Copies of this chain bind each other. A is one copy, B any other.
Amino acid sequence: HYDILRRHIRSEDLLETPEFGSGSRIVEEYWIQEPFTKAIIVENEDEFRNVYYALEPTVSSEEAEVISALYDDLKKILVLQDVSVDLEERAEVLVRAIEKTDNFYSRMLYYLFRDFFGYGLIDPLMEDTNVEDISCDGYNIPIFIYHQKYGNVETNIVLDQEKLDRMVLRLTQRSGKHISIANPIVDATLPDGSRLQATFGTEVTPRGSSFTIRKFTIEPLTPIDLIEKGTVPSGVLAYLWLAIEHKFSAIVVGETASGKTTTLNAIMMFIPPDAKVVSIEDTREIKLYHENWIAEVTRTGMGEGEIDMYDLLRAALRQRPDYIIVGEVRGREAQTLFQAMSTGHASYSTLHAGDINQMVYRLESEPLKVPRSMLQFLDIALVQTMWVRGNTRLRRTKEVNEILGIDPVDKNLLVNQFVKWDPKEDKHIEVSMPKKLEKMADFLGVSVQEVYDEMLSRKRYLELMLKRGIRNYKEVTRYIHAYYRNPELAMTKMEEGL
């Protein structure tokens, strides 16, 4: 959208500078869509809070209706709104059509685009990858957002009745729905691939029409990342890399906000480049730099057929995939998962609990109701934690539990604890042997020492990526995919900064 534009423009010194009266300090400033929009994070000494200010090329009140006029005509051009047309061409017409200062030109095309190809009033928010949530509550209420770093902050964008009503139609339409007083609520998904709740009128929202947008922008923490944060030691990560390659199933358990999903997504970047993976989640959260992958998302059924995790797994496990990822088990679908395990599908997921005992309880009891005897097919179960002191915010893998199996005439769940985390020294201690490594020698058909050797090898590879500052997930997945293809060549490039 902006590359096609930003060239058709003439000037480059568009948009002036911000002017905030006293008590309105400027915390930070950064670009969004240079050189059009820029965002400024202002403070406000009185109310210890920061505020998000959305900057766009300032215009004249004469240029107002002027630009709103050039638009009143370009609107009656069906060949513009048509999405069937590639944006590259569509733009051209708008330009040519506009032919019928060398600075006012550019600082104008911006809008003409922001309203035909952009998202309008909220484009600055849709484009900024720091804003992961947009909340337009009601008529004449300043929009709020969730900043990647600032969190909840008020915004300089407000929409009066009509301005918002049309906004809600714009979003609703681009998402492919027809919100009306007859169907005032829409829970669809925008083209950019984002979750949009929307309400028209005031029948359900006395505070007027409204909308919310949860942007899938994430930037998933990486295995290397976990090593840096001291969350999981490099050696444990290698053990998992192997485990994951061999299809040992794992569940990440932990108190709410302790790290479960992050860790999962992190270690899910260890999946073999060619393996077919299918994921089922209630809402997108998992980012993977993997191709042969199908992502399935649950359906609310607000106004259609409700398709839950159970429905989605049952028909996915049917495509007989290699790896199966279930966002988090919160019910019935849990049975199907363990069934998938008993069958050899490398299955992974999350579970809200504090220790293996709670894990077992939740899994066995309704709603999950996973049969006691099925637990044997789970291989590893990690336990994540949050640890705090000063502003000391720590997320750690409290423990790496190896589920050995079931016992006949028992207590049942046989667990061998490999790694334990001591908080007193913030250290991970080996408190038993990694038995699973033995099951690998059996799979692979080699000796333990041999496997142990590869672990130490894979371990080195990770510590190197760390030293070389290879943090991003896209780049990390590339170097791991690398190692899978040819560990020899992979290792050498790593040691030779390439």
Contact = CB atoms under 8 A, between A and B. Distances in A.
A283 B318 contact: yes
Contacts of A314: 300, 302
B315 A330 contact: no
Residue in A204, A295, A298 whose Cβ sees the most chain B Cβ within 10 Å: A204
A411 B365 contact: yes
A193 interface: no
A283 to B, nearest CB: 6
A197 B291 contact: no
Interface string A125-141: 00000000101011001
A295 B207 contact: yes
Contacts of A442: 388, 424
Interface of A: 47-49, 133, 135, 137-138, 141-142, 144, 146, 151-154, 182-185, 187, 195, 197, 199, 203-207, 210, 212, 214, 255-257, 273-276, 282-284, 291-300, 302, 304-305, 307, 311-312, 314-320, 322, 328, 330, 339, 342-344, 352, 354-355, 357-358, 361-362, 365-367, 371-374, 385-390, 392, 406, 408, 411, 424, 442-445, 485-486
Residue in A298, A318, A388, A444 whose Cβ sees the most chain B Cβ within 10 Å: A318
B206 A284 contact: yes
A197 B319 contact: yes
- Nearest 4 pairs of A and B residues by beta carbon: A388-B445, A152-B274, A256-B344, A212-B319
15 contacts: A135-B294, A146-B320, A185-B315, A203-B297, A203-B299, A204-B297, A204-B299, A205-B294, A205-B297, A212-B294, A256-B343, A257-B344, A330-B342, A389-B443, A392-B445
Contacts of A187: 315, 318
Contact of A293 (B137, B311, B443): B137
B205 A296 contact: yes
A48 B485 contact: yes
B357 A366 contact: no
Contacts of A358: 339, 342
Contacts of A344: 256-257, 385-388
Contact of A257 (B320, B355, B406): B320
Given A207-B295, A342-B352, A424-B442, 6 more contacts: A48-B485, A49-B273, A199-B296, A344-B385, A361-B406, A366-B372
Contacts of A297: 203-206
Given A339-B330, A485-B47, A185 B312 contact: yes
Given A257-B344, A312-B185, A442-B424, A154 B274 contact: yes
B339 A343 contact: no
Contact of A295 (B135, B206, B486): B206
Contacts of A443: 388-389
Contacts of A214: 318-320
A273 B408 CA distance: 43
A133 B389 contact: no
